[PDB]
């Protein structure tokens, strides 16, 4: 095995598993490693383009390297967590708002 | 502009933190991610002030 300075062309195998959508996961689409929900998507790609970016170059839709199916993406949900309350001097009850 | 600032190295090895994670985990990871944090922190602060 000689590893010449040029990039190595013959490599080991790629152990690829199944893809599940409508519930966010970490994902590994050949470099694309974000964290979000994948879903079916409609917008059409050209025969060779490989990502989908948008207004500020955020990875925004990707096609599976195995099957020609465009998938849309959205980062996992998240938001503030706050508490409304009557004063401690009038009660102790508490209602919580997820933002 | 703020979001665009995430696509810059600020003098580190890359513009993603995951790649530096992959390449080098021991101290040099600190002496690199230092710069990512410093730069991104400025960008946020200089958004807040104006």
């Amino acid at each position: 095995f000689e590893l010449l300075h040029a990039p190595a062309t013959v490599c080991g195998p790629k152990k690829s598993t199944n893809l599940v959508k409508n519930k966010c996961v970490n994902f590994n689409f050949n470099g694309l490693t974000g964290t979000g929900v994948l879903t079916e998507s409609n917008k059409k790609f050209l025969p060779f383009q490989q990502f989908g970016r948008d207004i500020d170059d955020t990875t925004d839709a990707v096609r599976d390297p195995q099957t020609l199916e465009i998938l849309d993406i959205t980062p996992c949900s998240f938001g503030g967590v706050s508490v409304i309350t009557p004063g401690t001097n009038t009660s102790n009850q508490v209602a919580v708002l997820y933002q | 502009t703020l979001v665009k600032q995430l696509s810059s190295n600020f003098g580190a090895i890359s513009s993603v933190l995951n790649d530096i994670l992959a390449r080098l985990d021991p101290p040099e990871a600190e002496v690199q991610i230092d710069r990512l944090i410093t730069g991104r922190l400025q960008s946020l602060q200089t958004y807040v002030t104006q």
Partner: peptide
């Protein structure tokens, strides 16, 4: 159903983001 007034509708029709943000 939205009781915007008429000239207010003209005004409205005239005038014309999730990497860690949110708009309340």
């Amino acid at each position: 159903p939205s009781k915007r007034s008429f000239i207010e509708d003209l005004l409205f029709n005239k005038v014309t983001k999730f990497n860690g943000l949110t708009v309340l």
